[PDB]
């Protein structure tokens, strides 16, 4: 239905998420979904009856990779919505998530790392999206985040905001089961020889990375100074254990300094928010540790303006990457410690959306399709050099992820996978929205015309359709 | 696409809806829809190339009718699961609707009157029952309670239960407007003169009768025992004036005395929940006033199992029917007064339902399909007599809302609506329930087939439907 | 214990209340606590062994008087503090009442009118007060306003404020009762005959007025845009007949355009808070009938600053005075409708005003003491007359509630209550704050030395007070 | 002020609290506080100035001891009436302590071991009654719980009770401050270099004890299946070494399996409610670490007919001491572990036990005065030996505490503190209620005229006092 196929990126500047100058002139020729040749324009020899771009005056840049979003749209679930969103979708959650994936598509990411969503339909969407069924970015996932609540738990309630309180319990527990697919806040309950076979199983289910709440979830509920651990140093061990005997990437969700160092003590191949510390600031040892150990980082972001914004309106999520997390960001910068962008993106509800000011919405870190765009931004602010900013969009998770073969830079061999931008990303890293083309293993998608078939962005809702 | 048609039901016991002595060996004849003929079994000739129902050893009654239903569950919504509900059928409210009249049609119930409910949904699907275009019981509605806001509204609250904090204000606000139709608690702000014409326009949209929020609706809010007026006399004059210019039938909520005292003043043609009075115990001069001005009064019952049910878990609702409302339900029946069945039934969502326990479930007043059943039997608990509970239940209700000269009896002329059971009501209430056929305008239903096509009951519901 | 005096006040401007021209180098003699001379500095001979002021380039004005506070801080419990001030002080809240009469004392305030507040202590302090056992303004009372809850009750809740949810029921029951004594939300559950006997006891009992709710209470639970009324017109006669059987002056509370009119077809003596609305503008025909019958209002406003601040943090009281409300208070001013001053002021505890910030503080309408000052310079914003002003704060509010024969006035025969400033209140209003001399039935007041034991202010609160 | 003194007890059977066999026909003697001879009856000669008690056909038993208190009443403030409480009685904790002590003594309890309270008025009560100054149960104290919130935090919350949300900030925020004293959860934020100053200056204020927060205190909020850790185990060493440095014993608090192990494996002092698991029954390993390494757990359990009400009403609490917890504290007697005696119990105040029913007053387990009945009859009901239930309220915690060279048995040396009971405990552990005498440092109490100025137990409450 979808396949690898043959095209040819010609005559533009091309940079290929190795780091180095750009090499204008450039040419990139893909064959059956596989680069086979990138060189000088009039040094690589192009038949006419082959599919070309014009990329003359134009960027060339490796398919855009995003480290962290949530194809069921998690942070809206962390305040208003969830009901609503998971009963108006229910017996299509892979379709939102094919939705969500070909949103990110169309802002030019050609791999998303989905770090908390439900198993099941994810499962279904990232299969029907790689053997060419659908539509879409191509995904790999965590299923759950080990030893979190679902959504109609305490992990996501505030202090006004309960759901439980106003919802059938049938429909909250039928969702936390999709979610926690057995492992929830139950497992810091267990003893380890219990944990270890759970664990287990739950990688045999077909996880492409495992992440793990090393602290707890309950920033919503008791704000972001007054961080947890969820399992035992003893437990914490077996958990890691399994995953690495299980091949596969371990992340973390840590929420104190404890709680990154912990993480780092561990190798963790991804540390998600490790710049959210509960408000103190990450020491100097603790950097150290990272140029030492040369561990992933990602961060999450705020941009100036947004988070000017959030601080006029009191807003209970300010001290996400805001005050201390932001000097936190900034000295991470400044110590070149190795950084992934990230976002906690998801396709948020329309009738979400439409709640929002102007300056909630202007630079907001969690709209899918254009968070990537805004991280980038906002870690340049914060002194951040342009292309190192790319390299955490494209080569740094791709690297963290294990992927790096396959993906997240233009070399031949990899993947053909491809951006090509109007304007200068290192000129100005707001350039990066100058899309004119996005490639998904050599073919070209027709990206304005994305989501081939809105769902959760249909829309205005009509109450009574006529059929 | 569906008719009046043509049938003869033979050699029964005819219960006629006028509360005479029940004739055996009667035979009804129906042509095109209307009822041609009625008579012993005998003197009335049926050529053989006529559909036939075969009465012999039953009892034949005039279709069931209900004085007070919602099509779109009001009950429900003044808990949990009014945001899962909304959410999930939206787009296809007016399908929810048809599917919750077909539902009271397989009841026997070939009458409904909607009492609350959304304007245009409910529009939609009167016009398409009607008009053949639709299967369910024939629907006659208020639209809006004037004067009451809607769902995500005071209303509908409860103390710890506040739709509003955990959903979108979008979505909040589109479906208070539904329901409302800028009918809402903005009204009690206003002068009679700007009051007048708001009234007026509603009444042009077309409804069959109009109910007005007499008292208050914030049971859920305050409890039972603290009402208020939602208008000045005053204002209430301006719109009881236009209901009557209008010439439909008017119709009162009350939740006090003196809320009861005021619709009868009125001169109400239908009084809903006439006994839910603040717990206070109704007047002598109340009741002699009911009996004098003959005025039809509903009452919603609670049968004894029920109650007590309610009275053992300290239930929030164990005061809408129960301790002093359950004695006026006595004393009205004992006094006499003209009494009209309704329930406040709906078809309630299978995951509420599936919330709760037998106790709950068994007897439940509000399950629309049952509701009728149980509320003649816990009437006949308290004292009625069996063959006026049936005219509560069929005649009294045609008679309040003045559609006695076409429905709600057995009699030439009117429609050919006709249910036949297997056993004796009169010996025995609880056998209305052994239906044996159901008849609408001389079409026989398939009445076992109903719902057509299950919506909101539809169940289990999978996560991930593969199409 | 405490008595009238003798003194004179020499030489001063004389502004006496009845809104004439001001008259300079005015004496004004006063013996045994009643004013026997008025006139000019050199026509009133007064020997030297008689206590003097030397109002000297002074002016000289009425004891002012408000003409509705609360003694036990309402306002307060209609959001935070009430548990914690209600819990602290049971055991002497006549002196809680005292404190708080001497804190008006200390502005210039020798009578107040509290118009809702607990029956035993608030007779217990205005008898002590009266017959000199205690210092402070004098007092008349209503006690509670009957239809309305207590404190823990739905009247004083908010949707995130709950105080019965964390404490005892029996406290909770307790404080409810010492303030409904028996006429809270329940009345509007009965009859007229049962209502009668109850509200004629009541009387009886001793009040100094009585203030009905017309309407409800409400607007902390539900905002300011759905009223309600909380008696049937049947009732509500009931409730007048009996005032005016006893004799006392009948206000009412009123929160509608409809409750407004309805206050003025019942003649009320004083209307509260009369042009809080709804949030819907007072019809011309209304202010026509207040002209015609001469009604007195008493109107509660905001100043420019103030209401600026709140809505700024979309304060939810910012419609109490705000938007039309304030439209109204202009329109009431420019017809000249009969206009007396009123805050619902109280002693605010100290806990709850260290949680303020500056625009909260500052010309916060509820700050008993200087509550006054505030009210007249906002409404000489909104275009009121100085004179106007300075009568709605001492001769209006006498009249209305039929004291004028007695106080409110510099006039011979009255009482001696007199107050002296600095600076002239007609040539800038917030002059009205430089009270030099405060005297009160011919005796001077220390009034810097009030309250003369700090109970509620007694600041900062120690943990351990070793005896 | 209050001394030492000289008694003799004479002739009665003797349960030392060594768990030997008792010797019946037995005579102690005292003398300036302390035990001096204990031996036949016949052998101890008795001048007959000397002040005796005479016990024969009695019990003699040493001063009962209770391993876990709270004198300012924290179980209590984890639901309703901590803001009444707090705010009723500031200026006085010191002698709501102190009356609680006495209620304890007036049980027959000589030493209580307070594992939470504040730190101020705690000293200066135990200060007080440790020199003669006042009357009371000696006291030991950990002051706060380290890394635990105060009242007005998470730690004491339920869904649907937040103090805060009705309370002012600055008063929540002073009595959080005098709980915590820098103690509270920002701790969890902070790397172990600047958390072991911080614990060290605490330990440095005069504690006796110290107990750690190991795992959470979030079961109001979240249930009793989601525990968490506090700290780091690398924090959490920086605090148990400077705890063995300062010398004093070490008390953990736990609420789960992997807490209890961790507990265990710091050889802690003392392991409060150790039993409390997460509702996950207690591996065989655990127990044989407990009997390896003897250490002490206390438990907290439930009798038979308090369990079975709490189940019936469906109590939040249920899970405290019911179901898993239960079956973990036969375990643990039935494997003959080492049980100390601790209830949690505080002296409750009179309007929050008025709230009670019935079935939650009998045997409450946090009633203090008669707690220890309680739980001593509650292990009995569990298989525990009466003597070894006896032991767990005498011996054990004096050792645990490092206190058995002075107190918790008759032994010559030690304090002379003794309690008489009129009938056999061994024969039935309900006898522990049959005290007829109650001697403290050889001086004899008057414990039925105990508490001495009633405070918090004074009641009824005027509202007005008249002086
Ligand atoms: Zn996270
Ligand atoms: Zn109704
Ligand atoms: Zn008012
Ligand atoms: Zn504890």
Redesign the interface.
Known sequence: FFEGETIAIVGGTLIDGNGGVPVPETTVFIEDGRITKVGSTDQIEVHPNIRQIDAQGKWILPGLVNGNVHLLDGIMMMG??????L??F?????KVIEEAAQIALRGGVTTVFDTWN?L??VT?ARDRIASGAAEGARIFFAGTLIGM?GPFT?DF?R?????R???????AD?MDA?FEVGMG??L?????AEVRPLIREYLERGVDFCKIAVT?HLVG??GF???????????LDVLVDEVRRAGVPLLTHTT????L??AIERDADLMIHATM????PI?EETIEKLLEKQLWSEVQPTTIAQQAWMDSVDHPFADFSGRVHHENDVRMIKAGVPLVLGTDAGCT?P??L??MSQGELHERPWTLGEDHFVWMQAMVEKGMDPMAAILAGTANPAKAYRKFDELGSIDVGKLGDVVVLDQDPLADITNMRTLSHVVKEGREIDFHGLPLSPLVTAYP??????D
Not at 80 to 85: F, L, P, Q, S, T
Not at 90 to 94: C, D, I, S
Not at 165 to 171: G, I, L, P, W
Request: charged share 25%; proline share 8%.
């Open positions: 208003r919505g969830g009901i609503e969103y009963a108006r229910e017996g299509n959650y892979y439900a099941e339909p279904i609540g305490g309630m202090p006004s905001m309960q759901a309180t106003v919802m059938s319990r049938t429909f039928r999709m806040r139950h810091s309950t267990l003893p380890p707890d509920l008791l100074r007054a961080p947890y651990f969820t399992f035992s140093e003893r437990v104190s300094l404890e709680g160092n912990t510390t509960g408000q103190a020491p509800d009738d979400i439409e709640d809702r009509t109450a009574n359709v006529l």
